Amino acid sequence: SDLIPAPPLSKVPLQQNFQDNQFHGKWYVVGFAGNAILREDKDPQKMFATIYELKEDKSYNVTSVLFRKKKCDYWIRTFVPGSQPGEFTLGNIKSYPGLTSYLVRVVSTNYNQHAMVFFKWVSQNREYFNITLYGRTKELTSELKENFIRFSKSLGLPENHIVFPVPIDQCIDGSAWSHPQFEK
Numbered sequence: 001s002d003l004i005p006a007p008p009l010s011k012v013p014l015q016q017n018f019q020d021n022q023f024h025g026k027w028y029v030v031g032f033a034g035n036a037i038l039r040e041d042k043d044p045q046k047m048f049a050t051i052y053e054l055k056e057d058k059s060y061n062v063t064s065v066l067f068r069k070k071k072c073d074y075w076i077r078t079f080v081p082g083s084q085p086g087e088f089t090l091g092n093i094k095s096y097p098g099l100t101s102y103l104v105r106v107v108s109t110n111y112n113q114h115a116m117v118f119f120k121w122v123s124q125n126r127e128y129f130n131i132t133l134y135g136r137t138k139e140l141t142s143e144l145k146e147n148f149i150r151f152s153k154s155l156g157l158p159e160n161h162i163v164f165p166v167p168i169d170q171c172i173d174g175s176a177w178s179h180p181q182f183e184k
């Protein structure tokens with residue numbers, strides 16, 4: 001079975017006059033849609049966070065923090081500025097065997113609340129992509145979430161390939177200090 005084909009970059013807008021400094025810091029994964037992700041409601045994906053640290057050389061050190069089994073997991077990698085502002089490629093791709101390309105395109109952001117970012121990669125000659133909806137908080141509006149579904153569908157993704165990860169406290173919010181909620 002083949003994957004839904006990756007859309008042409010023509011269908012994927014680029015945030016105009018992208019501001020690398022304002023994009024920095026922590027984002028939560030509020031939505032995640034892609035040709036290799038399947039929504040599964042019995043044991044749903046938990047929310048994770050991705051921290052973008054802008055380096056002197058204007059690359060990002062990008063650190064994803066996830067809760068997996070009963071430990072914190074990480075994916076640390078470098079996003080190197082690409083051909084246009086708001087585009088990046090994966091640094092040290094030589095160290096990812098079978099990965100022949102990895103492209104990042106910031107679609108839209110207002111920097112202080114939300115962003116949508118497109119990722120496309122090629123691995124053992126198959127084409128993969130996702131769209132991420134990032135929030136500065138763990139919840140976004142229904143409007144931002146329906147916009148994300150719309151955009152996802154415009155790139156060829158049916159609803160069963162669109163996931164809204166369940167908010168969590170462990171690992172991803174190092175300062176939430178959660179406790180039992182009064183009249184939750």
Ligand SMILES: *Oc1cc([N+](=O)[O-])ccc1*
Pocket residue numbers: 050063064065066074075130
């Ligand atoms: O798309 C995507 C990103 C991560 N991450 O750790 O940053 C993990 C799985 C999927």
